[PDB]
Every structure is written in structure tokens, then in C-alpha cells.
């Protein structure tokens, strides 16, 4: 009847590659990759800069990096479990479609 759906320009593979590139830049350069060149920096130093920016001393991180990594892994696991169990996570996109 004339209703034709056109595919988007950027495919899913290109979106995934963009996401992976942004993630790599974030984890390897902190915030310097967006303002200019991607300056390499260790992740325990990016976390120290984040803690210093939010108003927390860096010695807390340098002493509890193990606990912070464990909490981050547990949070990622809980997020994955919620995404696998709760179907209403992408409810906005589902309602749009």
C-alpha cells in the first residue's frame, strides 16, 4: 500500500564499533581523548583523578582499589542480571517501536 521502511545509514556494526572505540578511549585516556590527543594513563590513576575531582582524597583509592574493583564487578553482575531478568529495561525503545 506504499508504506516503505528505510534502513538507517549507520548499521549496527558501525554503532558497535563506535561504542567500542569510545569505551577504549575512555578507559585509556580518561577525558583527554575528547579534548584532544588520547594521552595514555593507567586506570588506577584515572580513578584517582575522578576521586580528586569529586572531592575525595586519592589515598582512599590507593588503599581500597581491590574493594572498589570488587564492588564494580558485583555492580556489573547485578546490572547484567537485571537486564536478563527484567524485560522492562528497554521499555522506552519498545514503546517507540
Amino acid at each position: 500500500n506504499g508504506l516503505t521502511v528505510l534502513p538507517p545509514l549507520l548499521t549496527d556494526e558501525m554503532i558497535a564499533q563506535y561504542t567500542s572505540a569510545l569505551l577504549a578511549g575512555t578507559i585509556t585516556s580518561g577525558w583527554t581523548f575528547g579534548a584532544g590527543p588520547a594521552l595514555q594513563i593507567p586506570f588506577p590513576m584515572q580513578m584517582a583523578y575522578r576521586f580528586n575531582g569529586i572531592g575525595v582524597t586519592q589515598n582512599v583509592l590507593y588503599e581500597n582499589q581491590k574493594l572498589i574493583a570488587n564492588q564494580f564487578n558485583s555492580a556489573i553482575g547485578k546490572i547484567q542480571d537485571s537486564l536478563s531478568s527484567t524485560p522492562s529495561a528497554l521499555g522506552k525503545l519498545q514503546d517507540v517501536v
Binding site: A35, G36, Q40, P44, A48, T57, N59, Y62, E63
Partner: protein
């Protein structure tokens, strides 16, 4: 840094003056320094190593300075921070 507005027909033009770093160099970094049995963390800078010595410099510019008590603070011992190195800390009160 700053911006300069400009008039335009049915619009406006912004002249954003930004700070773009350039001419970067690789350096060896360390989380803390263990000189007097305790760890020394940077106050507003970051430890860098040119290969033979250690210096303190800011994040957005390379300005090597001698590791002094005024640039670092003491917090905790050394057997907790992972990857801490040993380096001397200059004390201005000793020559005075």
C-alpha cells in the same frame, strides 16, 4: 577558555577559544613515593620519571619540579599501595 559572540542574520555565531594540548611525550609514572617509611601522594600534580629521576608536574602541562614536602602529603604506610616506588623527598627545612 573563553568565547566571543558574533551577530548573524536570524542567528548567532560563537567563537569558542579552546585549549588543545600538543607535543605530548611518554613518561614513567608512579602511584606514590616511599621515603620516610610512609607513602607520599601528589597534592595537585603527578609523579613523572625521565628515566633516572622523579619529578612532580601538573596534568595539563609538563613542568618538572623537585619532589618536596610542600607538593606532597603523607597518608598511610607503603605496604598497602600497589606499585609504590622508593625515591627521596627533599625537605626545605634541612638546609635552612
Amino acid at each position: 577558555l573563553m568565547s566571543f559572540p558574533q551577530s548573524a542574520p536570524h542567528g548567532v555565531v560563537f567563537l569558542h577559544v579552546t585549549y588543545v594540548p600538543a607535543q605530548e611525550k611518554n613518561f614513567t609514572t608512579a602511584p606514590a613515593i616511599c621515603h620516610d617509611g610512609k607513602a607520599h601522594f601528589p597534592r595537585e600534580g603527578v609523579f613523572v620519571s625521565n628515566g633516572t629521576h622523579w619529578f612532580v608536574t601538573q596534568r595539563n602541562f609538563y613542568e618538572p619540579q623537585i619532589i618536596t614536602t610542600d607538593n606532597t602529603f603523607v597518608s598511610g604506610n607503603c605496604d598497602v599501595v600497589i606499585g609504590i616506588v622508593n625515591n627521596t623527598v627533599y625537605d626545605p627545612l634541612q638546609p635552612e
